Design a protein around this ligand. Sequence first.
Ligand SMILES: NC(=O)c1ccc[n+]([C@@H]2O[C@H](COP(=O)([O-])OP(=O)(O)OC[C@H]3O[C@@H](n4cnc5c(N)ncnc54)[C@H](OP(=O)(O)O)[C@@H]3O)[C@@H](O)[C@H]2O)c1
Ligand SMILES: CCCCCc1nc(N)nc(N)c1OCCCOc1ccccc1CCC(=O)O
Length: 163
Amino acid sequence: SVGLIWAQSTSGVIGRDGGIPWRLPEDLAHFKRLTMGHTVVMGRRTWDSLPAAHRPLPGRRNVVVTRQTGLVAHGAQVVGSLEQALSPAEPDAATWVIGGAQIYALALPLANRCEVTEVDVDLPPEDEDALAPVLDQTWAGTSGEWLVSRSGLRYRMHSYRRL
Ligand SMILES: NC(=O)c1ccc[n+]([C@@H]2O[C@H](COP(=O)([O-])OP(=O)(O)OC[C@H]3O[C@@H](n4cnc5c(N)ncnc54)[C@H](OP(=O)(O)O)[C@@H]3O)[C@@H](O)[C@H]2O)c1
Ligand SMILES: CCCCCc1nc(N)nc(N)c1OCCCOc1ccccc1CCC(=O)O
């Protein structure tokens, strides 16, 4: 099982200026609950984007997809392709692809699940933004209710499975 997991604004922005252009603690807790104890696969730019306290993501096997020989920042297992990231895999569990946009594009043809957090923040896309992948007719989804963050932002979760 290969799952994509991401958070996006309603406009579809996932990344800006090498980070995430909102703060939503409830999404971080959701992300930890779904990924804890599993392999997480990410692109190298996302790896370098992690604050030092969160790199590597604790309690998870951190796999970084890169064309380089290796990385200056410690804690990852490097691979040269998504296929190398995905095999071998954890039994009875999902391998989670955790971004960014380039790695989501590579993984989308292979995924069987997407777990999306939608954040109701008004962020008109800017020229260099990373955007969420668009799901085609092979996906069926369900959506949770709108929730209110302690910070006041509305947010909700959507879950998609491959038909
Ligand atoms: N909102 C969310 O849920 C979420 C989640 C994750 C990330 N983000 C944001 O997304 C942005 C980063 O996304 P991004 O698309 O710019 O970068 P990315 O997908 O994280 O990483 C891109 C890098 O992955 C490597 N790569 C890409 N395709 C490859 C291939 N076919 N084979 C081998 N290596 C390959 C390359 O590393 P090398 O250059 O080292 O070769 C490339 O520079 C940041 O703003 C981050 O904060 C948001
Ligand atoms: C602060 C928002 C964190 C979740 C964003 C997110 N939210 C969802 N729903 N899906 C994602 N793929 C994602 O991105 C993960 C990579 C970025 O992680 C980061 C970044 C910076 C600080 C901390 C972490 C994770 C720490 C941990 O899991 O212990």
